[PDB]
């Protein structure tokens, strides 16, 4: 009676409405609009600091909300809280398993997440009493490697995993409150909205999904890329986000009238993007690459406004402070640079 | 403004207590020689063994310490998390080597070696390759139950190399089969040369007592070719 091939045919009818709905609202392109504004000019940054001390390659970093401290996680099995004004060190924390793939700094400055190929997120209470740092909760529910994690407050943390699921956790009870399903491919990154009611997530199918944190569903689905997505980040006002992927492109998507708006590509670039990030105003866009460079694009004109070329191996991570004063990059040569 | 100079000197001594522990941690990271053990799954850790996600077993040969990691509880999409293992010394690859009756488990092992060897980030990592699970009569040519001329259309037109060392008493046509499977590898190895890594084959059996020695004697060759390349000699 053939149930499978008419359910697979109804989805073709349902998808052709969504493509024709987005086509009906495409009254102009973005480069038709912004072709009258003045350019940004060439920019340059000069590597104000350099932070040495890791034994193996660096996979992640995260600034603090006070724009001074930062975390860094490396495959030798360490986790360092640097101070960026004076290049000192606080709290080199040793890990239980060495393959860590992500880290996060809580907005209260009280905890530090990490996780990796051991399928476990860890909490590491910093502002402690009667002792040094210690692991606190050790969340464990996933069946694949842990690829990202971000704090909401000191009791909720949303994690991304390699078993195609996102999840929302409850510290001090340990089990997960909400479990997000729907991807087909390893979820590689995430980013929260500035009001923290929603978050986006891109995976190894060429797709990105908007999720409701409080509800537990998926609102929209964005498909314009061609390979695995490795990075994502929101715009400052929260009404847009930009992705980076293996097809040497970055793209800009708006939430309302779900389609893409801009594509950041160049003919000399044949390498994949490992990180994206925005400036404070949202005019620049800073992407790391696999050919050891770090370009800078104009988010309203799709031009290229500069380059940052200081590392020896590929750039894994990237991040701009909340006041917008500096950019930190990290790479597989185990050094971090601060550019300004 | 000397009120700044109170606590930042305590910050300054908090920097030197950290650096003293990192000196003790560099000394044991620099002398531990990580290895990654991956196979098709059937042989696995039956051979490479000294008598949750990552499993972590360590051992010691000649007062030199090692690490071996078997990957478990992960999915079968390997294009990520395989590039977390690029600064290891070697990748111990285990092949069942008796795949004629369960499928074609032998051809699937060849496609995986072609993806690992040519990857991008694994271009500098040498592979120690064990051809496990001999079974010279059972499911092989000493009994003639299954034919390898039908699974590979060659090997009916192939002869044994000039210098093949048999065991005294070993079947003249099982040594023709044992060296053909090894020669399906080493032509994926000896084609591309821009990576500068190697491939080292071996034959393991049921009695593999010496099998921590052949991995010791060849991780010594891997470090030797790294230091010789520093002087532009290779």
């Amino acid at each position, epitope marked *: 009676q053939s149930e499978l091939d008419q359910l*697979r045919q109804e989805a073709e009818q349902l*998808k052709n409405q969504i493509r024709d709905a987005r086509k009906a609202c495409a009254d102009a392109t973005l480069s038709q609009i912004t072709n009258n504004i003045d350019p940004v000019g060439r920019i340059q940054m000069r590597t104000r600091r350099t932070l040495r001390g890791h034994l193996a390659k660096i996979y992640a970093m995260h600034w603090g909300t006070d724009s001074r401290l930062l975390v860094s996680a490396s495959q030798d099995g360490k986790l360092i809280i640097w101070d960026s004004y004076t290049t000192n060190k606080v709290h080199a924390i040793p890990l239980r398993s060495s393959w860590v793939m992500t880290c996060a700094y809580a907005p209260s400055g009280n905890y530090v997440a990490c996780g990796g190929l051991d399928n476990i997120c860890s909490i590491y209470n910093l502002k402690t009493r009667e002792g040094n740092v210690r692991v606190s909760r050790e969340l464990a529910g996933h069946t694949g490697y842990l690829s990202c994690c971000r704090f909401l407050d000191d009791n909720q943390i949303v994690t991304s995993s390699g078993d195609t699921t996102c999840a929302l956790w409850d510290i001090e009870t340990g089990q997960q409150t909400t479990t997000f399903t729907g991807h*087909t*491919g390893d979820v590689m990154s995430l980013s929260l909205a500035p009001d923290t009611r929603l978050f986006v997530s891109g995976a*190894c*199918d*060429a797709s990105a999904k908007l999720w409701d944190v409080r509800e537990g569903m998926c609102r929209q689905t964005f*498909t314009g890329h*061609e*390979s*695995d997505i490795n990075a994502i980040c929101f715009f400052p006002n929260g009404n847009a986000f930009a992705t980076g992927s*293996d*097809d*040497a492109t970055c793209r800009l998507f708006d939430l309302r009238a779900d389609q893409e708006l801009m594509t950041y590509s160049h003919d000399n670039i*044949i390498c*994949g993007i490992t990180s994206v990030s925005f400036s404070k105003s949202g005019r620049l866009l800073l992407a790391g690459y696999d050919d050891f460079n770090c370009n800078v694009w104009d988010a309203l004109k799709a031009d290229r406004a500069g380059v940052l070329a200081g590392h020896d191996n590929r750039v894994s991570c990237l991040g701009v402070t909340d006041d917008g004063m500096a950019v930190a990059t990290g790479s597989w040569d185990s050094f971090l640079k601060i550019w300004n | 403004t000397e009120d700044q100079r109170n606590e930042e000197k305590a910050q300054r001594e908090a920097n030197k207590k950290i650096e003293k522990q990192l000196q003790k941690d560099k000394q044991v990271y620099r002398a531990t020689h990580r290895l990654l053990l991956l196979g098709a799954g059937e042989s696995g850790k039956n051979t490479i063994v000294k008598q949750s996600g990552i499993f972590e077993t360590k051992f010691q040969v000649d007062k030199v310490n090692f690490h071996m990691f078997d990957v478990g509880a992960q999915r*079968d*999409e*390997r*294009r990520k998390w*395989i590039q977390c293992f690029n600064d290891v010394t070697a990748i111990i690859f285990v092949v069942a080597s008796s795949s004629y009756n369960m*499928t*074609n488990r032998l*051809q*699937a092992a060849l*496609k995986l070696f*072609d*993806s*690992i060897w*040519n*990857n*991008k980030w694994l271009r500098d990592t040498s592979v120690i390759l064990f051809l496990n699970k001999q079974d010279l009569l059972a499911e092989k040519v000493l009994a003639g139950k299954s034919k390898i001329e*039908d*699974y*590979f*259309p*060659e090997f009916a037109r192939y002869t044994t190399p000039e210098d093949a060392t048999p065991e005294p008493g070993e079947d003249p046509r099982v040594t023709r089969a044992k060296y053909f499977i090894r020669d399906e590898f080493l032509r994926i190895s000896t084609a591309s040369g821009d990576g500068r890594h190697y491939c080292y084959p071996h034959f393991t059996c049921a009695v593999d007592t010496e099998n921590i020695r052949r991995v010791f004697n060849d991780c010594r060759d891997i470090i030797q070719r790294m230091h010789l390349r520093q002087y532009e000699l290779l």
Partner: nanobody
Amino acid sequence: QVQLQESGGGLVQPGGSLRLSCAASGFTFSNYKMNWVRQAPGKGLEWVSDISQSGASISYTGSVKGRFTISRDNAKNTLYLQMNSLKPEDTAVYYCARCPAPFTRDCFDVTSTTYAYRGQGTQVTVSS
């Protein structure tokens, strides 16, 4: 939306012939190298052939070595597979899979269950 729609497969007598096809859309066809995989009932997915970027660098498996042939046409985003002298071992559904990244020579997750860049497949049957 990356999509790959195979067509042109059905039942035939042994010793006969059949030519499959695939129309690819959603990406630049010239940068990726393609594959063909199959799944006999009760076994699992296995690899059949591949072909590089516009190249005459073609690989086959040992079972269908002397009688199968592949061909791509980059001008129309199409991938073919001409099959001849079919045997009852060739009773499987055949998918068209591409490599995950452009301009590469490794190709990892083709013969994997739950793989993204792969069609739904076409049935090919032989019977006497």
